[PDB]
Amino acid sequence: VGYDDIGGCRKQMAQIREMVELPLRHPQLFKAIGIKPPRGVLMYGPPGTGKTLMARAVANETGAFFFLINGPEVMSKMAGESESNLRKAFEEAEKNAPAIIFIDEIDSIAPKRDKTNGEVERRVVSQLLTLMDGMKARSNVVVIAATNRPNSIDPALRRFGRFDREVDIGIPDATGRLEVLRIHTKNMKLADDVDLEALAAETHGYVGADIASLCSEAAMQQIREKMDIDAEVLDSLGVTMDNFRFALGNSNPSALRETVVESVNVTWDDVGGLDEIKEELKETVEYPVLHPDQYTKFGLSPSKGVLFYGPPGTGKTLLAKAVATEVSANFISVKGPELLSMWYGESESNIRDIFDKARAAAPTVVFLDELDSIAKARGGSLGDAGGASDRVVNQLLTEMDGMNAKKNVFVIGATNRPDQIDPAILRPGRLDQLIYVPLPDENARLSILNAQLRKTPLEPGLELTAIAKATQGFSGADLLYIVQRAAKYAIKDSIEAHRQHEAEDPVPYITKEHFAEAMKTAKRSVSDAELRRYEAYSQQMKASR
C-alpha cells in the first residue's frame, strides 16, 4: 500500500503526511520556527472510509518505527497489568528510535470516565492521560488514533498535548468516488465499454469499501457468466459494463443496509394521468442532484419538500413507488406510526437516527406516508401521554429546519387529511409545495385503464372509451376494481371451460361481455361529502388569492 491507494481525500492525506513526515525529515526547520508540531491526531468518520487504510499506508511508507495497539489488546486479567502493558509499549516505542504509535478503535480504551462504572477501565484511561502528558510525557514519538464515535471520548483526553488536531475523514464526493474507482480498477482487466464517470455519478452514497464491494460483485458476475480449466477461458474475461450495471442495481450503500426497502417494481408508464405532476416531480428531484452548477451560478439552494393531498386512492403511494424505483437518489420509505415507542424519548431518537442516515447517504429521498399520524396539531390533545406527540412534531420541525447543513434531503409527505397537519410544517422551507391530486377526468381514466391493461390481452374490438365515458366519479382504485372483477370473471370462465374439457386454449382474451358484466357492481369510492371537503380546502387555499 502507498499514497496511490488512499483516494478521495486529498486534504486529509496531505495533512497527515506532512504532520508525520515533515517533523521527522526536517527537525531543524521546526527548531528554527521554535514550536513543536502537533503530535497526536484522531481520525474520525463513518466506517469504511479509509482510516485504517491511511494508517497502513503511513506504516508502509514511513521508514520509522511503527507500533500498533488494538483497543482491547491492552487489558489483561491480573490486577494492574493493563497499565503495565501500556507503559511497556510506550517505553519500547521511545527507547529504540523515533516512532509512530497507532491506536485502532480508541473508543474501547477511552470512555467518558463519567458514565462508566468500572474500575480497571478508569485506571487505564488515567494511565493513558499520564503517559501522554506529564513529567517525562513523550519524546520524538507521534500518536495516531482511529475512531468511529469521537463523542464517546472523555474531553480531557482531546485537549492540546494529547490529541490537538482532528482530521475528519468523511464521505467522498463524486470526484472522490471516481478516483477510488480508478484506483480499484487499476489491476483487473476491463472491456472498453466501461465508463467510470457515469458509474461514479450514479453511485450516490457509496463510501470507500462500498466501491470495492461493487467491483468485487461485478467481477463475480462476470465469473459466473463465462463458467457455464483451460487458458482459453482463463484469458479473455472482459468485465463488461453490464456487469457493473447489474452489481450497482443489486447493491446498496452500507449506511442504508439497515433500512433497505423491499424491491417493488413499478414504472412511470404505470402511472396514468397526472402528467404535469409527474413532470413537476421529475423537475424538482433530478435538477438539484444532476445540475448543481446552475444553482450555484444563481446562488440559491434548491427546493426540497413536497406534500401530496387528495381523496384516497388517487395515486399518492403510487407516485411514491415510482419515485422509489425510477430515481437515482437513495430512498428511505418510512411508515407513519412505526417510529413511535413506549419508552421516553425513543421516538425522537429514532427520528434523529433516520434523518442522520438520510443526510449521511445524500442525496436522499424520504417518504412520510400519512403525515397526519405523527405530525398533528400541537396542544389539541388534552389527555396525552406527557406530550410525546408534541415532542415528536417539534423534533420533526427542528430536524427538517434547524442548525443543519441543507445538503440534499427530499421529503415527500402523503396524507388525505390536510387539515390535521401542523401549520408549522406547511410553511415554505419544510414542505414548500402542496400538490393537490384530484380525481381523474376522462382522458386520465383512459390513460389509467391502459396503464393497468398494458400486460393484459384483450379482444381487438374492445374500445375503452365507453368505459371511460361511463365512469364519472371513479378513482384509480375504482378502475382497478373494475379490471379485477373482469379478470376474475374471465378466470371463472376458463375454469369451467377446462372442467368441461376434462369432463370427457379456451379463452385467450377478456371479452366485452366480461367487462360489461363485471361493470354491474362498479362503485365510486369517494362520496360527495369528501369531494366537497377537498374542494373547500382547495378553495380556502386559493382564498388567499
Binding site: 491480573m78 490486577a79 468500572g118 413506549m342 419508552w343 389527555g383 396525552d384 401521554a385 410525546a388
Partner: peptide
Amino acid sequence: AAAAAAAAAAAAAVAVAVAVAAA
C-alpha cells in the same frame, strides 16, 4: 498473586402511558 474481575449487573428504564378522558 491477585486478579481482577468484570461485572455487568442491570439497568432500569422509564415507560410512557396513555390516558383516556371523559371531556
